[PDB]
Amino acid sequence: MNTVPFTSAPIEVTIGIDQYSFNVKENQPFHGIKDIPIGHVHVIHFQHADNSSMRYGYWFDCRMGNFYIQYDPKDGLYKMMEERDGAKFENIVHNFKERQMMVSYPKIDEDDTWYNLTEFVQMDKIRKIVRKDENQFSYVDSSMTTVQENELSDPAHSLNYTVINFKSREAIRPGHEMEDFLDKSYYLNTVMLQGIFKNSSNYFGELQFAFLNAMFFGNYGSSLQWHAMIELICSSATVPKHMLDKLDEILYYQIKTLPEQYSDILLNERVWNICLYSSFQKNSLHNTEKIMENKYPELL
């Protein structure tokens, strides 16, 4: 069970750790988060009390190094940093734990929510979507634009999601225009799965990461990417049965975890109505259709 210690909390901030969140007062004796489950990626996120604009945060994996947070009063944010000195780190965390200055990652034993949301998400894939190779952890915020969004303006600070475009030469084989546009199986299976992702695990990982960036930061480009990856599978007549079963599970947990009051901006009416009621896969997503109908019948 790993720890992300904090130097201090000099500004009042709502702190997120995965699907949990804590309010910390200005100069409250807070020294971080302990008992973080090993084996999953995690995200630690921040909304300042003084500026509910810019949600921002850090994707990290405690197996990859010793990470701490320190407020930077120049850039005005909580920064993730790596402590390379293993014994300095253990010694700081030991003191903070002894003084009970750390909140405990509040996982219920029965609860597989985080595993279910992050099943296919790997730090190595996150770091290729979010390029800052000198760090082992990945910064994301509300404002970051996607490579695709930038094509339609600072490349370094972009989310490099796989570009999906249903009206592109990549998506449409010459002489298969109607066939490829109305049945995207070619684009899903050959171009994206075999060509670019190599397997459905990498595809699902990016889809899951896009959702979590949409949900935790209100990142609009991430939400576009999540919907595009759902729609590409749903609009394909030919999908491996195991992919359809797993997609149903993934979407079920995403819809279960979504805050009820964000469904209006985070869920695309057209995509969901098309995926659940018109598409090739309209009958392949039992769990997802039942939770959407019982939780968001207005959107449909």
Partner: protein
């Protein structure tokens, strides 16, 4: 974006553009079967592709053989239309390629956009205008060449005959839209108006009667009267 009353003059500028109308591509007679069920029998159709500036009509005849063994024909018709328009643009030399294609029906936008991905500089546009191009099959010589076709065929026409010798495109397009609106609203009345006077003939190389300028004013007046009457009857006003 959309072509409307506001940007109407753009049709007659020096940017090559084509209107594409797909309303006569897939045509059926609905009939009873021996068992008292309903079946369709397709008849020959056409894509109506028109340069509104020059009057050049690229009438691609859609022979019933193209539907043989195919499903969802109203959807295929849109894609077949886009394939033929794409083929036509690729067959034209570069300097003759349209800079814009305006579809009369919004359902044509995605099929045409997908077929024209090789032409990212050709803008595909809808219109808010209710253009009467569906009445193209009320022009006898166009109807005749469509119904006689025994195979796929492209036939080239000037839908303005020789009018551009005497009037501007703008005026030629207004006359065409008035004749087609009349033919669409009451085909019998409109055809009566156009042929009644036997001294006025259609030249072998023309679609419409050889009217003097004064005879056109009279004809145009009779067409507006036809259109307003039928509109009264439609809406008891």
């Amino acid at each position: 974006g959309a072509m409307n009353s506001s940007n109407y003059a753009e049709l007659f500028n020096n940017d090559i553009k084509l209107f594409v109308d797909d309303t006569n591509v897939y045509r059926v007679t609905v009939h009873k079967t021996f068992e008292g069920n309903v079946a369709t029998k397709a008849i020959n159709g056409c894509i109506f592709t028109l340069n509104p500036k020059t009057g050049h009509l690229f009438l691609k005849i859609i022979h019933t053989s193209v539907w043989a063994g195919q499903k969802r024909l109203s959807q295929l018709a849109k894609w077949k239309t886009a394939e033929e328009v794409s083929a036509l643009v690729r067959s034209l030399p570069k300097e003759e390629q349209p800079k814009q294609i305006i579809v009369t029906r919004k359902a044509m936008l995605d099929p045409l956009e997908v077929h024209m991905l090789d032409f990212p500089n050709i803008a595909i546009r809808p219109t808010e205008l209710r253009l009467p191009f569906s009445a193209a099959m009320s022009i006898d010589k166009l109807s005749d060449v469509v119904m006689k076709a025994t195979e796929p065929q492209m036939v080239l026409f000037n839908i303005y005959d020789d009018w551009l010798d005497r009037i501007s495109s703008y005026t030629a397009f207004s006359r065409l839209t008035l004749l087609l609106r009349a033919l669409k609203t009451n085909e019998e009345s409109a055809k009566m108006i156009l042929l009644s006077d036997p001294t006025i003939t259609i030249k072998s190389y023309h679609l419409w009667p050889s009217f003097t300028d004064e005879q056109w004013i009279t004809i145009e007046s009779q067409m507006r009267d036809l259109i307003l009457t039928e509109y009264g009857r439609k809406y008891n006003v």
